[PDB]
Structures are given as structure tokens and as C-alpha cells.
Amino acid sequence: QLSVIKEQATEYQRLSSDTRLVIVNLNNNLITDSSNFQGIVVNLNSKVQGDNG
Amino acid sequence: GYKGLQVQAQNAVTAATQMSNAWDSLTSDLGSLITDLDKGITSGDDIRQLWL
Amino acid sequence: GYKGLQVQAQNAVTAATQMSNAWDSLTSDLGSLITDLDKGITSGDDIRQLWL
Amino acid sequence: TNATTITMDQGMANQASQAMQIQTYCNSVKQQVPVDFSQFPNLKDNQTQINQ
Amino acid sequence: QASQAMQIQTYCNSVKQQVPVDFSQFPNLKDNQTQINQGLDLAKGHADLYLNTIQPQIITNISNISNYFALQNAIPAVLPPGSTKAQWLR
Ligand SMILES: [Cl-]
Ligand SMILES: [Cl-]
Ligand SMILES: [Cl-]
Ligand SMILES: [Cl-]
Ligand SMILES: [Cl-]
Ligand code: NA
């Protein structure tokens, strides 16, 4: 009964660990999007700075 | 528009990072449980009780 | 950004070092307790009260 | 003992607050934007250096 | 709303995170640089001392006091049931 719980817990630990990798991927996707957006704003700002001169 | 989206995304990063940390605690805590069980299954009469 | 990250890392070293030293005190202090019990300076009756 | 317990406590806390700071800085660093000097042939090398 | 210790803790964490400055591109600020960086370096020293030596020390000393008087939460003013006056004085 203890060994079956230990096996079971080990299965769940692996699932937990796997979920974490999925989340890593999510974080990188979000970080990429956030970054691309910052870039857009920066490039627009520089075009407007130019047009104002 | 993009400034606003940028903020939403940045907030999303924070949220995702918090999710990571939450799952890390679960994994580590399951690890502790696995250790405690394993060391209790292969131990003396009162040492067994300690680990369990 | 790099300069700042460098600082964050340096701060992290300090923090990690403090954690190691905290664990070292626990280990050393448990050692003292083992010695004190073995030498008969303390007993499991009064050590029990300490922990509770 | 009492003081050792507190050292463990404080050690943990200092390490976790510190961790959030570097965590944030790392998420913040990963969000940074490359440079583009493509309109300046004389800076082509500085670009590949900076972005690497 | 934050405890006294939380306020000092915040200041400490905040100061430790600063980055030293480099005004080498501004000769007019050479002195401000050495002032800022010396000031900062010292402050980080103080911060570390608080975070890993003083705050714990305070929490420790108070725990010890707190426990002892938790147990001895009162003083027997009369002679407690069944004791020599000799034992009571000890
Ligand atoms: Cl999955
Ligand atoms: Cl753009
Ligand atoms: Cl103590
Ligand atoms: Cl050029
Ligand atoms: Cl490039
Ligand atoms: Na040791």
C-alpha cells in the first residue's frame, strides 16, 4: 500500500515536471510577443521623432 | 495600441512565471514525499515511523 | 541591462552563501546535540522538551 | 536550537526575496530588443557584436 | 501598514539591487561618480549586515525572551501550595 502510493506519487511528480516544461514554452512565447511589441513601439517612435524634425 | 498590448503581454509573462514557480513547488514537494516513502519502506521500526 | 543582471547575480551569490551557512549551522548544531547526548550532558527527555 | 531555527528562517527568506528580484530582471532581460543598423554599412559589425 | 522590520527590509533589498554608475563620458561628473559609488558600496554593506546579522539577531533574542516569559507568565506572591519557604525563595 505504501509502495503503490510511492509509485503513484512518482507518476504525478513526472506530470508536474512535464507541466512545468509546457509553462516554460508558454513563458518564452509571451516573452517573444512582449519583445516584438516593444520593438514595434520603438520603431514607430523613431519614425515620428523623424517626421517631427 | 502596441504599447498597450506590450503591457498586457508583460503582465502575462509575470503570470506565467508565477505559474512556473507554483508547479516547481509541487514537483519539489512530491519529490520530498517520494523520498520520505522510500526511506520509510527500507528502514527500522521507529525510523520507519519517523519517515512515514 | 548586463550590468544590472551582473548585480542581480552577485546578490544571488550572497543569498545562496547565506543559505549554505544556515544549513551548516543546523548540521553542526545537530552534531553538538549528538555529542552532548552521547557524553550524557543531555537526555532525550529534555531534548524532547526543547524540540516541542 | 532557537537561534539556528531563526537563521534557517532568515536564510530562506533572504534567498526567496532575492530570487524574485533576479527572476524579474531575467524576464525583463529576455524581453529586450536587438539593434538594427542596416541603414549604416559602417556599423554592420557593431550590430552583429551587440546582438550576439 | 508594513511592520518596522518590513520597512527596513524593503530599503535594504532595494539598495542592494542598485548598479554603480559610470559617468566617464562626462568629465564634469567625475566627482559625482566616486561619491555615488562609494556611498552605494557602503550602503550595500549596511544592508547585508541588517539582512543576515541584525534582523535575525533581533528575532532570535525576542524569541528566547518570548518563550521564557510565556512559561513564567506570573510571579507567586504567596507561598504556593506545598513548598518550604526555602524552596519558594529558590
Ligand atoms: Cl502533459
Ligand atoms: Cl514598428
Ligand atoms: Cl537561542
Ligand atoms: Cl554608415
Ligand atoms: Cl545581427
Ligand atoms: Na558540518
Ligand code: NA
Ligand atoms: Na552610504
